[PDB]
Amino acid sequence: GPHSLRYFVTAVSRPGLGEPRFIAVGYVDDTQFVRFDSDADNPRFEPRAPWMEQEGPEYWEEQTQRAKSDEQWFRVSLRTAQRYYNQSKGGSHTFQRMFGCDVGSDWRLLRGYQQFAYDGRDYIALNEDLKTWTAADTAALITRRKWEQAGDAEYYRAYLEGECVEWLRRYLELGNETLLRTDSPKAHVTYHPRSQVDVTLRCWALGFYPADITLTWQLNGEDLTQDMELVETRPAGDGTFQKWAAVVVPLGKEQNYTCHVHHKGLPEPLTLRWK
């Protein structure tokens, strides 16, 4: 590996618009493979990767049933949290759920995640020991008492150790030709005449995977990653990503700056100079 399996579940209340919207997206590494959307026609988990369709109906049945369960679970938890905060009933609120798991190359659990957030803010989160809970406030404190009373930790701690992993190993095989791949980034530096003395140089990183990558500018050893114009790595749509960094520099000094690309697919970081 190392590899990871993640599910990002979202639930937002709709005051006077009917029941709340429940969305669930599942990922492996930086690739999306499953989804559930209450606002869809005939809600049910569906594959989003070609290699997921290689799964039987029973897999799909079960998955859907759980998503449907959590749809109820969230309607209530959302009404519950509403009271906890003494908020009014005509306001919409967001409840987020994160869970999944990181695995080492030994294919054994390495890190487990089960956390919650209300209205965009940390609410309650399992700790690394997988036996304790970290409540963000007094309201989340009554939730920890409940969840410990039911020994929920145990079950989740059990899920991460077994399920997510066993299934991760599987998803990885089914989608090996696209999950195991590594597309190196294709870099170049564009010249953009700024003023009469400056020029905006920009080196791009295209077609790479995993999403993780390092783009930097340097001036005679000097690291300028604070004076850089750096975007947030972005998806191209075909399963790979792009990104770029830009620096403003003087005329006739363009050659004095280098661009350094670091990625998993490159056996040795790239470097680029203009002219």
Partner: peptide
């Protein structure tokens, strides 16, 4: 594989 939440907040 998706996992159900258990107890409620």
């Amino acid at each position: 594989t998706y996992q159900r939440t258990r107890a409620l907040v």
